[PDB]
Scaffold this active site. Structure first.
Site, mmCIF file in Angstrom:
data_model
loop_
_atom_site.group_PDB
_atom_site.id
_atom_site.type_symbol
_atom_site.label_atom_id
_atom_site.label_comp_id
_atom_site.label_asym_id
_atom_site.label_seq_id
_atom_site.Cartn_x
_atom_site.Cartn_y
_atom_site.Cartn_z
ATOM 1 N N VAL A 1 16.353 17.252 8.511
ATOM 2 C CA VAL A 1 17.688 17.835 8.653
ATOM 3 C C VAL A 1 18.740 16.852 8.159
ATOM 4 C CG1 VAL A 1 19.381 18.800 10.277
ATOM 5 C CG2 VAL A 1 16.913 19.098 10.710
ATOM 6 N N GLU B 1 23.262 10.038 6.367
ATOM 7 C CA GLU B 1 22.285 9.647 5.360
ATOM 8 C C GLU B 1 22.916 9.113 4.082
ATOM 9 O OE1 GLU B 1 22.445 12.771 6.633
ATOM 10 O OE2 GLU B 1 20.510 13.277 7.539
ATOM 11 N N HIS C 1 0.819 -1.220 0.000
ATOM 12 C CA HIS C 1 0.000 0.000 0.000
ATOM 13 C C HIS C 1 0.858 1.277 0.000
ATOM 14 C CE1 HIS C 1 0.264 0.116 4.525
ATOM 15 N NE2 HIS C 1 0.160 1.415 4.306
ATOM 16 N N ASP D 1 0.798 2.105 19.896
ATOM 17 C CA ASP D 1 0.470 1.551 18.582
ATOM 18 C C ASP D 1 1.292 2.223 17.486
ATOM 19 O OD1 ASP D 1 -0.912 -0.013 16.707
ATOM 20 O OD2 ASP D 1 -2.849 0.934 17.069
ATOM 21 N N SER D 2 1.317 1.609 16.308
ATOM 22 C CA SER D 2 1.794 2.288 15.106
ATOM 23 C C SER D 2 0.643 3.135 14.564
ATOM 24 C CB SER D 2 2.270 1.285 14.051
ATOM 25 O OG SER D 2 1.245 0.377 13.702
ATOM 26 N N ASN E 1 16.544 12.568 12.126
ATOM 27 C CA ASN E 1 15.670 13.683 11.790
ATOM 28 C C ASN E 1 15.509 13.739 10.275
ATOM 29 O OD1 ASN E 1 14.532 16.289 11.222
ATOM 30 N ND2 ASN E 1 15.128 16.926 13.291
ATOM 31 N N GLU F 1 18.759 7.717 8.385
ATOM 32 C CA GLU F 1 17.989 8.865 8.857
ATOM 33 C C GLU F 1 17.702 8.815 10.346
ATOM 34 O OE1 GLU F 1 17.288 11.541 7.523
ATOM 35 O OE2 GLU F 1 16.703 11.380 5.423
ATOM 36 N N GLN G 1 -0.567 6.284 11.161
ATOM 37 C CA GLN G 1 -0.385 6.834 9.822
ATOM 38 C C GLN G 1 1.034 7.366 9.629
ATOM 39 O OE1 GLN G 1 -3.388 9.747 8.874
ATOM 40 N NE2 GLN G 1 -2.652 10.011 6.761
ATOM 41 N N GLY G 2 1.682 6.957 8.539
ATOM 42 C CA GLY G 2 3.064 7.353 8.263
ATOM 43 C C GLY G 2 4.098 6.328 8.702
ATOM 44 N N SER H 1 3.413 3.199 8.108
ATOM 45 C CA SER H 1 3.177 2.255 7.011
ATOM 46 C C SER H 1 4.455 1.780 6.340
ATOM 47 C CB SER H 1 2.331 2.927 5.924
ATOM 48 O OG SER H 1 0.982 3.063 6.309
ATOM 49 N N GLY H 2 4.587 0.466 6.193
ATOM 50 C CA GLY H 2 5.700 -0.127 5.463
ATOM 51 C C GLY H 2 6.930 -0.382 6.310
ATOM 52 N N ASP I 1 0.109 -7.634 1.879
ATOM 53 C CA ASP I 1 0.560 -6.239 1.873
ATOM 54 C C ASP I 1 2.079 -6.158 2.011
ATOM 55 O OD1 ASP I 1 0.546 -3.485 1.797
ATOM 56 O OD2 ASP I 1 -0.241 -3.223 3.827
#
Ligand SMILES: COC(=O)[C@@H]1C[C@@H](N)CN1C
Ligand SMILES: [Ca+2]
Length: 223
Positions: A57, A62, A40, A171-172, A54, A52, A174-175, A177-178, A84
């Site tokens: 920044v 990175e 998804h 909990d986990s 932050n 990563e 939105q964002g 995801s994956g 999924d």
């Protein structure tokens, strides 16, 4: 992540951020060329961001590498979220080090009660909305199949498991995801779905990675 803690910079070295002008999903580095994420999370124009903390920044550890291809699972159903899972190949191999490292795939499925680490840059509120800049972490147990199914009647397939707390609060969201669910050094889950976040009797639902190890290995071997 709701009700979690600040992980600490680069303490989750397999955690990636998928960026299309902005962070939109998590992922897990499984070797120098490949990331596992949720189906998804599929879109075109993905840049994989490794090392990563932050995400707003440039802090110095990175690696930014564009995806050369994405492979959504052949049996992914976007309505039910069954299967999924998706693979993303990097255009160039990541330079692996203490802060950018792959996570092992499972050799067997993990049991109810197994303690895991879930991480991401998702929403930290269960009612409102606040997105963190730094990586957040949550320690959470895998829940029994029976409690998962009774929490979500008619929705839990053999390719899903619940993790978290039936009391809510942690909990986990939105964002996230994956992103990874790692248990005893193995990637057992992918942040998939839930009904809101951190709500009582609605724990997070995760893609059951152990079901996909053969597909992952064979796909990597030919792509
Ligand atoms: C808004 O809720 C979500 O988007 C969810 C909830 C989580 N448990 C995993 N998600 C991606
Ligand atoms: Ca950064």
């Amino acid at each position: 992540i709701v009700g979690g803690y600040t992980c600490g910079a680069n303490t989750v070295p397999y955690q990636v951020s998928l960026n299309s002008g902005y962070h939109f999903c998590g992922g897990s580095l499984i070797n120098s060329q490949w990331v596992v994420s949720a189906a998804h999370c599929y879109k075109s124009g993905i840049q994989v961001r490794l090392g990563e903390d932050n995400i707003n920044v440039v802090e110095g550890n990175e690696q930014f590498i564009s995806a050369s291809k994405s492979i959504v699972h052949p049996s992914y159903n976007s309505n039910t979220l069954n299967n999924d899972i998706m693979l993303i190949k990097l255009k160039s191999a990541a330079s692996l080090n203490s802060r950018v490292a792959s996570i092992s795939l499972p050799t067997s499925c993990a049991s109810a009660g197994t303690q895991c680490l879930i991480s991401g840059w998702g929403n930290t509120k269960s009612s409102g909305t606040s997105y963190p800049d730094v990586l957040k972490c949550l320690k959470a147990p895998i829940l029994s199949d029976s409690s998962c199914k009774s929490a979500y009647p008619g929705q839990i397939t053999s390719n899903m498991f619940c993790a978290g707390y039936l009391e809510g609060g942690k909990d986990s969201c939105q964002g996230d995801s994956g992103g990874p669910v790692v248990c005893s050094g193995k990637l057992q889950g992918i942040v998939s779905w839930g009904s809101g976040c951190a709500q009582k009797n609605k724990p997070g639902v995760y893609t059951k990675v152990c079901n996909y190890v053969s597909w992952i290995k064979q796909t990597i071997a030919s792509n």
